[PDB]
Every structure is written in structure tokens, then in C-alpha cells.
């Protein structure tokens, strides 16, 4: 988990980490290139406070007058069936479609849920067009207003590209307020200065400048209207109260004072400069999400790789087994590769390591009480028969006579791999229905005598206790230089602990990443309980990255 | 309790955790889907302070005038017998019912507790209807008012759906003010700006906009009736004081006060009349559902950890080996009246018993005799299961096995192997039977079996009798193995009496039932009695924790 280990596993998993980081950056870049650009326009309003004005601008009288001025409750979008059709259309350089509807009146379904009757325009040419509400397509021409089925459309200046689809939505006036008010924004930047910087953000650049100018003009007009409206209510009741006659003349003097004031009462709000749209979109923020894509890919990659590190629990190196006090006799690397590897590809790495095992056993197998070696995998799929068979081959070619007993009576398949006469296997001998001679075979490849399990017997462990088995071993250890026995795991059945009574040397075979140290520890302790002293293990299937062996020649 | 152990038990208990988290999330879904929506409407009120205004709008003078204006003390609900009938009615798309009562006068029961006389409207059609107060159903039609039994009711524009029930409550004016006031709210957002955000929240969307509009109008008229009242008091005194140049000056002031009074532009303007946000603000969807998820998750965690800190039994042979107990086996639970070792010989729980046979055969050599005693740490430790199957799995090997069931209190081996209940073990110790008529032969396992026989009155006094050692000495010569079942030592002392003659003694501990304390005390009490317990035999270990697996 150290920095060195970190970089090691990173370069080892460089494919995964770069793949995930690159794919998230691909999502980021496609999103940055497909998200519609959003321009921002600004204006400067000057007054002589400004705290009421930042709230009166965003009031519904102001926005509500712009909406009715520009008909912004008539919403128009070019149709693109995919969620990214519009973005790719912009990327291709296609000029976006746009039309002007000066007067819209839907059939006004205006239901509780679907209060936005949605219609689609099919552009037929630059002059005529067709409108489908729910299938009923009404063909129409710009100029002439379409008044059918309670549906009133006055659409003019339709765009060029025909065949397009334009979704029209007569969303409610309150909605046409709320969206704008969401986009609209005000500030002061002087905390007392009359300057207000209105900002409106939107997609259609030319539209937002007009909308902001409309807001500014409405604000100008309404402030002119208010100061005058004070005097206007005064004037209204003066007009209502005119009938004493000298007082009538005094009221006429006040009337003439008030009347002109209304026309002349223009002030207190100022458009220092009308709205213009900044050509550079402010959103989507390029180079701010792509770096977020990079960092998101990096963080998720590390949080996944660390999770996988804390996932696996199998053996990782012989040092783990030697920590418990287990003499790992070999580390057989996994070979890329029906005949024996030790005779098919005699110079493979996995066979060089088995020769390295042969020498170490040859040293460790003298002083053993007899020349019978028992090899029991830690579990199925630990390769016990692979290692035992190749070891038998590599010891046969040396020149010693080897007998390879496959005492895995439960699911042993060595006879399925050496070529066999399935009759008269091992089990058929223990049952007493076969003699010691008709069971041995000759693997022509390895050159070592082979004894197969034969038929699966109903009672394996009961058979192995029969005293004929020790007779077999006593005879063979006199007629052979080495005897290798295959036995089932000790975590599953007790066959291994029965055969181990007669074996001089016993070894476990542990698959590299499959079997855990717990399985080896429990297996060795369970062998000891049964009076069988496990000599050591033979780590197997170690990946070539962690295997010390390499080609030499 | 470690992260690995945490996730292991979570996946093991994945059914429980997902079940409870899912059902609380379902409760959250149904609540969020049935909780009646509440809309809020907004209006904007300007002044040129606003600190008095935020408390004068909420005064009873203003609210109580809207109440009397819109008849808000006349409360109406569509009736739904369940607590969720209204919600599901909305779910089904059914348009909610509503009527209009322009004039309600109940009998005015107005008791101390039931100061809110409640009646129910039964909609008969679009024109007529019936009202039951306490059973007395009065039929009436819109238009004509029902004035009977002191009940003056004028309902018009009754809804369409007939047969419905409408609960009508003439709640007192103070309550009809207080509810509006708890829903009502004010703010300023400028701290000196005249801008006030009136906000009112209700369920009926169209109603609350009208309510807030009426509040605004009442407030506006009240502001007129303060300032126009100042000018009107001045003008009223002029009108009362008018009795010639001074008269013309007073007439000038008269018309000036006329215009100043009647103009009376309020310091307040309604910026924009109240409108209702179509999106309900409560119930807050996706804010309680996530709270439902986190609540289910936290309660699942706190319950699973509690159950973790609930069980005290053995959890693995390592716990026994820590104390210094040689766990000779771990027999897993078998799914499965004949012996398992002859019924289903390939069962995992029998493979483990063969594994025990081999370890005993090694560990039982050098023992002073071939007698094995197996005593469970408690009843329901499966002692007889293990001993019987072990005797079977040793019998098929070919050794002659004698199986003595010395559980003279509640032994039931004869109830399992098929029996001649006469002449059991007790009938031998009592001296009324000889050693030969007590022995049987289980045809299945193939081992000679000695039943306890009749429950004696004094078990322990019998077992001390010297005939028992005669039996064992004779058997150990005529049999290759002798297995003795004995009662738990924590309950009676028979086990420590038989153990004097047993070469090997083993305890059987159920996996999660028996604790480490029971095993430790059992071995200490065996030691005090001069019986050296060889080791334990963990029993009934669950397949999740056992290393055994099928092979073949």
C-alpha cells in the first residue's frame, strides 16, 4: 500500500486507470461541446438607495409587462429527437431554426397537469407550413391567420429550412414570469451608487438583448408613471370635485400646476447603456468541467482500485506462508498452455520450476521413513494433479522408476488425461476384485507407472482404511524408487488424513490467488490432529509478474 | 465487528436489512404520495420602517375583516373515511369536491368542548341535497335557504358529484383568525425597503390567492381610513364650523381638504396581487424520501449491531482453542428416523464425523482403555446425534462397537434405534437383569447398543454401584470401542461418575447455543472430579462458517 506499491499497482493497472479516466474525460468533453451555449447580456441603470429597486425590477408587474410586450409565453424550440440533437446540429455548423409568432391562441386545453398545450410546426417551405396538434395537421401560410378548431395562429417570417419540427408551448403567464425571473439578476456594486447592473442570461443571443431592453424600458416608463400617478390621483379627484367660485379658480390654479407636471415628470432612473450581449458564452463553462472530468475519473479510479486491493484475500507471495512457519518448497509459475507439459514443452517456465522442486524434494526426501510422497491440494482447482503429474514426469526422465497413484477416489481424472484402461483402477483393487498387477499402467509420455482410481466407489474413506492399501504401498515402495499419491483436500473429506499415515513426505498445493492462508493453516492443523506432519506447501499458479523465474537461453 | 465482518454479516443478513429499509422507504413513498399538497401564494407590498406593518397586518383587526368578508369561519371538507382517502382520491385523478355556502347559521350548540357544531352535507344531485346534523336529514336545494330547527343554511353552486359527504364546521371567529394567522407570514427582504413579501400557504390553490388579495385590500382600505381620516377630521370640523373674506379663505381650505382627503394615496401599494405557485411546497418530495432511506439505513445498522451484541454462544473453534480446548471436529448442520450415517452416507455432516473418527483413532491410542465418554455441554447439544453417528461410522469400518446410553434421566436412544425397552441399563445396575439380555443390535449402524431402560428413581446412586465397572471391564474385552452417553455435568453429576472409568472424554457444544463459559465451567468441574476432558466437539456449525463442502 506504500507509495512504491501504489505506483507499481498503478502501472500494472495502467490500462484500467487510463481507460476510466479517459472515458470520463470523453463524457466531459462531449458534454462541454454539446451543452447549449448560454450568453449573458448586461445593462447599466443609474439612480440617485437602490435597495427597493433591486426588488421592484424583479416584481411581477415589470416582468409581466415585458412578457405581454414580447409574447414570451409563446415558446418556440427546434425539434431534435435525441437529447443531444441540438448540440450536434450546432457542432455541424447548421444555422439554428427560428420563427416569429406574433399571435398565438391554442385550443386552450389548459388541464390541471398539462396546462401547457404542446403543438408541433412542420415547415413545408419558406411560405406555407403545417401544424399537427394531436395528428390533425392544419396546413397554413404566413400572413393569413389560421383559425380552426379553436386554434388561432398568426405565424410569420418562418425560417428557411423546411421539413423541420417546431414545438410550440403556450405556457402560463406565471410560468413565463418565473423562468425569466430565474434568469434575471440585479446588483449595485457601489452599495449606495445609483448604478445597477442588470444581467440577463439565455441561449438565443439576439433575443436576450431585446428582452433586457424591454425590461429597462418598462422600468423607465413605470417610474415616469408613478411619480406622475401621485399627482394623477390628485388630478382625478380635482376633476371629480369641480363644481366657492373663487375657490374654484384656486382649484384651477392647482389643476394647471398638476397637469403639466405629469407630462414633465421624467427622472430618477437612467439607462446609461442599453443591453448588449457578450459574444462569449458564460455557460457551459469549458475548461472547468473537463478538469472536473479528469479529477472525477482520477478519484473514482483510485477509490475503485483501493477497493479491489482490499477485496482479494488469497495468497500473494510465499513470504505470507513462511510467516506462519510453512516451508514453501516451490513457486510454480502459471504456464500459458492433453499430454503432459513436462513432455509437450519441456523447456517451459512452469517445468523449470518443477525441476527446481524436484531437486529441493530430492534433498528433503532423504531421511524420510519411506519413499512415498503424498501431495494434497488445498482445495479443488489448486492444480494438485498438474503438479504431481509433471513432477512424476520430470523425475521419470531422470532415470528413477516412479509410480503415480491417483488416490482421489471421489473425482479423480488422471486416467482421463494419461490415456487409460478404466477397468481395474485403484478402487477395484481395494474391493479385492483386482490384483496388484492389473491396476498399474504405463504412461508412454512421461515414462512413469500410473494407477488410476477406477470406478467411483460408494464408500471411499471406508475403502482407504482397508489393509490392502498398505500392502500395495509396501510392495510398491520395494519395487519403485518414488511413489506419488494424489489425495482429495483435507478441508472436504478425510481421505488425505487416512493416506497420510503411510506417507513419508506430505505437501500441500496452494493456488496462488484462490486459496487463502486460512485454508492452508487449517489444513495443516487438521493434518497434525490426525497424526500427519505436513512437510510444506507448493505454491502454484503464481502469476509471471510475481514469479522470479524467467526464460534463460 | 470489523469492516470485513460488517459487510459479511450485512450480506448474510441482506434479506433483513433490505426488507426493513425497503418497508420504511415504502412508508415514505406512501406518505409523500398521500400527504395532502399545500400550495403557497405570494404578494408584494411596498411602503416608503415596515416594522410596525409586519405586526399590523397580522393583527386581528385586519385578518378578522377578511374572515367576515369571505365567510372563512365556514369550513368545508370533502369527507373521506380513511386517513388517506383524500390523497388516493387525488391520485385517481378525481376532481376534488367543493361547494359554496354564502350563509351558514348552525343551531349554535357551541358547547365548552364541542364549540364547533359539525354537520355533514349529503349531495343528492346538482340542485338538491340533504344535511344530517345528528341523524335528522333535512333535504334542501340551492337557492332556497333551509331554516329549520334553528339551522339557517344557504348553500349554492353545489358541486357535481352526488352522494358525497361534506363536513361543515362553523368554527369560532377567533379560531378562524388563528388558523389564517398561523398560515400567514410576512417579511421585508430589505430591512428598510417598503417591500413586504406577504405569503399565505393553503391547500385550495384558488382560495388562498383570494384570501391574500382580500388581506391586501383590507390593509389598503385601512391605510386610507387612517390618513383620509386625518384629513376628514379636519374637513369635518371645517364643515361643522362654517358660519366673508375669512369665509372665502375657509372655503379655499375646504376644497384643499376635500382633495387631500379624497385623494388619500396610501403609503402602501399592492405591487402585484397574490398569485399561487402551481408547484406545491409541502409535502417536500425527495426530501423525506431520502430521509426515509437514511432512517431505514440507520435503524438497520443500530438493530444489526444490537443483534451482534445479543448472541453470546461459540462462534468458531478458535474461541474454544483460545481457552486451551482441543476442538476435535466441527460437525455442520445437516438438512435432514434411521441414522444419518446409514440414511444419507454422503452427507456433509457425516463426512465431518468420519473426519472426527480419524482424529479420535489417532488421539485415542495410548488411552488406558477403549472406552469413550461423550457428554454434551447441555441438553440440545446434539450429543446423541454425534455419538450414534460416530458409532455407525466406526462400525462400517469393521470394529465391534458397543454404544451404552448412560443418560439414565431422559435418554431416548431406544426411541431412535428400535428397541426392546425392557432390560435396559438401569435394569442391569439394579441387578434384575444380566449383562447379556440388555445388549441389542441396531440393524442399521451395525453396532451393539445398550438402552438406558426404565428411568430409575436414583440415577447417580445407581451409577456408583460396582456392577457398572464390571460391565465396562467385560465389554472393553468383548468390544473394540465403547461409547457412553452421559448427561451434562452442569445439570447432574452422572457424567463425572462414569468418567472415572473412561479413557477418553469429549464435550459436545452446539454451535451458537452453548457459550464458552459453559464449556470452561464444565471442564473445571470435570477436573475437580478427577476426570480429564480430552477436548471438545463443536457441533451444529452453520454452513456459512464451516469449511466443509460437497466434493464429488
Author numbering:
A (entry chain C): 17 to 64, 85 to 279, 384 to 477, 494 to 709
B (entry chain B): 17 to 64, 85 to 279, 385 to 477, 494 to 709
Quote the study on this structure.
Gram-negative species couple polymerization with translocation across the periplasm and outer membrane and the master regulator of the system is the tyrosine autokinase, Wzc. The tyrosine autokinase domain forms the cytoplasm region, while the periplasmic region contains small folded motifs and helical bundles. Autophosphorylation of the tyrosine-rich C-terminus of Wzc results in disassembly of the octamer into multiply phosphorylated monomers.
A 2.8 Å-resolution structure of the WzcK540M4YE octamer was determined using the same approach as WzcK540M. Overall, this structure has similar octameric (rmsd 3.1 Å over 4520 Cα atoms) and monomeric (rmsd of 2.5 Å over 651 Cα atoms) arrangements seen in WzcK540M. Motif 3 still possesses the same three structural arrangements seen in WzcK540M but only two (not three) monomers have the fully ordered class i arrangement (rmsd of 0.4 Å for 133 Cα atoms). This can be visualised by superimposing the core kinase domains of monomer for WzcK540M and WzcK540M4YE, which shows a rigid body rotation of 11° at the other end of the molecule. Superposition using all the Cα atoms in octamer reveals shifts in the periplasmic helices, particularly those in class ii. Comparing WzcK540M vs WzcK540M4YE revealed the distribution of arrangements changed, suggesting the helical bundles are particularly sensitive to changes elsewhere in the structure.
